[PDB]
Symmetry: C3
Subunit: 145 residues, 3 copies
Amino acid sequence: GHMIHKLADVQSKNIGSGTRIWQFCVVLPSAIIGENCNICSHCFIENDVKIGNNVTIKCGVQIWDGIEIEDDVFIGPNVTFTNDKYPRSKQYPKEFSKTIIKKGASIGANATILPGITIGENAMIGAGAIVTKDVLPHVTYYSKI
Amino acid sequence: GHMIHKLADVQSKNIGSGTRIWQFCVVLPSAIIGENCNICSHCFIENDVKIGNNVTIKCGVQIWDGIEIEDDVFIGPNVTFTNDKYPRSKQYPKEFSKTIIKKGASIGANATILPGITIGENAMIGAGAIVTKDVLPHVTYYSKI
Amino acid sequence: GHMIHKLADVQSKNIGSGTRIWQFCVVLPSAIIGENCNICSHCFIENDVKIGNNVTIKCGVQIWDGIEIEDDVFIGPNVTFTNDKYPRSKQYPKEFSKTIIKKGASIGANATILPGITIGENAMIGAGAIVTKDVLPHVTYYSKI
Ligand SMILES: CC(C)(COP(=O)(O)OP(=O)(O)OC[C@H]1O[C@@H](n2cnc3c(N)ncnc32)[C@H](O)[C@@H]1OP(=O)(O)O)[C@@H](O)C(=O)NCCC(=O)NCCS
Ligand SMILES: CC(C)(COP(=O)(O)OP(=O)(O)OC[C@H]1O[C@@H](n2cnc3c(N)ncnc32)[C@H](O)[C@@H]1OP(=O)(O)O)[C@@H](O)C(=O)NCCC(=O)NCCS
Ligand SMILES: CC(C)(COP(=O)(O)OP(=O)(O)OC[C@H]1O[C@@H](n2cnc3c(N)ncnc32)[C@H](O)[C@@H]1OP(=O)(O)O)[C@@H](O)C(=O)NCCC(=O)NCCS
Ligand SMILES: Cc1cn([C@H]2C[C@H](O)[C@@H](COP(=O)(O)OP(=O)(O)O[C@H]3O[C@H](C)[C@@H](O)[C@H](N)[C@H]3O)O2)c(=O)[nH]c1=O
Ligand SMILES: Cc1cn([C@H]2C[C@H](O)[C@@H](COP(=O)(O)OP(=O)(O)O[C@H]3O[C@H](C)[C@@H](O)[C@H](N)[C@H]3O)O2)c(=O)[nH]c1=O
Ligand SMILES: Cc1cn([C@H]2C[C@H](O)[C@@H](COP(=O)(O)OP(=O)(O)O[C@H]3O[C@H](C)[C@@H](O)[C@H](N)[C@H]3O)O2)c(=O)[nH]c1=O
Ligand code: NA
C-alpha cells in the first residue's frame, strides 16, 4: 500500500506501493507517482505529471503540467519549476514547455528551473541556482555569487 | 459567486465574482481581491492588501501588509515579497514599506522583491531574480548568473 | 499558554508560553520551541530542532534536523535551510550537517543557507542571498546581482 496523510488532498489513484504523501499536499487526478516516493508537506502536483520510483520531493515543491521526474531523483525543498517562458495572466499557451529531470539527478534547495529544461542523469544542481539551460549528465551546476 | 476551497482559511468577505481561492490558503479579514483572480494553493494574503481583477497568484506566494497588485498581474510560484528593509524579531516599524505591482506586470517564479518597490505596467521579472530597485514599465529584468 | 492553530499539526509538547503556531504548520514531536515565538503559516519543523525565545519564523520556512535557532532571531519568508551537502534520493548520511543561527541574527526573505553554516549574532542576510560560508557576527551579507 501507500500512505496518504489525512491532511493531504490526493485525487490521483495512480500512486505506487510504499509512496508517502505528507500533510497539506495537493495531487490532481492524472498525476502518476511510482513506488517508494516521499512527497513531503506543502507540495503541489498537477495533472500532466509523471514521477518515477524512489523519488524524494522535499517540502514546498510544485510540479506543473509538462514536468517528468525519472527514478531516484532528489528534489530539494522549495525547488521551483516553470512551464511558461513569457507568462501573462489569463494568456494560456497552446502547449506548456516540458521539463524532464533524468534518473538519479539531484536539485538543490530553492533552485529555480526555467521552462523546457532537461537536467541529465545524476546531475547535481547547487542550492539557490537558476537553471536557464540544460545541465549535462553527471555535471555539478551552480549560480556564481 | 466566488469559489473558496473548504481547505482554505478565507476570513475576507471582500472577494470579487469568479475568483478561485485554493487549498491551504490563508486570507485575513481586510484583504481586497477583485474579480476572476486565481489564488493557487499554499498562499498567504495579509490585511493591508489590495489585489485587482484577473490576477493570477501561483502557489506558495505571501502578500504582506503594504502590498498592492493591480489588474491582469501574473505572480509566479514562490515569488517572495518583503515590507521591512532591516528586519529584527519583535522590532515593529511605524510604517511597513509599500510595494505596488502595476497593471499587466509579470513576476517570474521564485523571484524576490525588496521593500518599497514599484514594478511598472507590463514589466517581466525573470525567474529567480532579486529586485532591489524599481523596474520600469514594459522592461524585462533578470539577475545575471 | 501557547496558541496552536486548529489547522496546524503540532506533535511537540516542548512549546514555550506565548508562542503562536499558525495554519498548515507541521511540528514533529522532538522539536523544542521557546517563549513568545511566532511560527507563521506553511512552516515545517523537524525533530532534531531547537528554537529559542522571541524567534520570528515567517511563512513557508522548513527547519530540518540539525538546525538550531537562538533567541531573538528573525527568519524571513521562504528562507530555505539544508542539512545534506551532496543529496542523493534514499542515500542517508550517518550525520546531517548542523546549522546554527546565532542570537539576534536576521535572514532575509527567500535566502538559501547551505549545510553546516553558522550565522553570527546580529548578522543581516540580504533577501534572496545564497549563504555558502559562515557569516560573521553583525555582518550584512548579500549575493551580488
Ligand atoms: C553545489 C554543491 C554540491 C557544491 O559542492 P562542491 O562542488 O563541493 O563545491 P564547494 O563546496 O567546493 O564550493 C566551491 C565554490 O563554489 C561555491 N558554491 C558552492 N555551492 C554553491 C551554490 N549552491 N551556489 C553558489 N556558489 C556555490 C563555494 O562558495 C565555493 O566558492 P569559492 O571557490 O569561491 O570558495 C553544494 O554547495 C550544494 O549546493 N549542495 C546542495 C545542498 C542542498 O540543497 N541540499 C538539499 C537539501 S538538504
Ligand atoms: C526573463 C525571461 C523572460 C527571459 O526571456 P528572454 O528575454 O527571451 O531571454 P533569453 O531566453 O533570450 O536569455 C537571454 C540571456 O539571459 C539569460 N536568462 C534568461 N532568463 C534568465 C533568468 N530568469 N535569470 C537569469 N538569467 C536569465 C539566459 O541564460 C541568456 O544568457 P546568454 O545570453 O548568456 O545565453 C525568461 O528567461 C524568464 O525568466 N521567464 C519567466 C519564467 C517563469 O517564471 N514563468 C512563471 C511560472 S510558469
Ligand atoms: C541586505 C539589505 C539589508 C541591504 O541594506 P543596505 O546595506 O542598506 O543596502 P543598500 O540598500 O544600501 O544597497 C546597497 C547595494 O546592494 C544592493 N543590494 C541590497 N540588498 C541586496 C540584496 N538583498 N541582494 C542583492 N543586492 C542587494 C543594492 O542594489 C545596492 O546596489 P548598488 O550599490 O549597485 O546601488 C537589504 O537590501 C535587504 O535585503 N533586506 C532584507 C529584506 C527582507 O528580506 N525582509 C524580511 C521580510 S519583511
Ligand atoms: C513525519 C513527517 C515527515 N515528512 C517528510 C519531511 C521529512 O523531512 C521527511 C522524512 O523522511 P525521510 O525519508 O527520512 O527523509 P527524506 O528522504 O525526505 O530526506 C532526508 O534525507 C535526505 C537524503 C536528505 O538529503 C534530506 N535533507 C533529509 O530531509 O518526510 C513530512 O513532510 N511530514 C511528516 O509528518
Ligand atoms: C484544481 C486546482 C488548481 N489549483 C491552481 C494551481 C493550478 O496550476 C491552477 C490551474 O488553474 P489555471 O487557471 O488553469 O492556471 P493558472 O492561470 O493559474 O496558471 C497556468 O496558466 C498560466 C498562464 C501559466 O503561466 C502557468 N504556469 C499555469 O500554471 O489552479 C490549485 O491550487 N488547486 C487545485 O486543486
Ligand atoms: C493572523 C495570522 C498571522 N499569521 C502570521 C503571519 C503574519 O504576518 C503574522 C503577524 O504577526 P506579527 O507578530 O504581527 O508579525 P511578525 O512579527 O511575524 O512579522 C511582522 O513584523 C516583522 C518585524 C516584519 O519584519 C515582518 N515583515 C512582519 O510581517 O503572523 C499567520 O500565519 N496566520 C494568521 O492567521
Ligand atoms: Na523560494
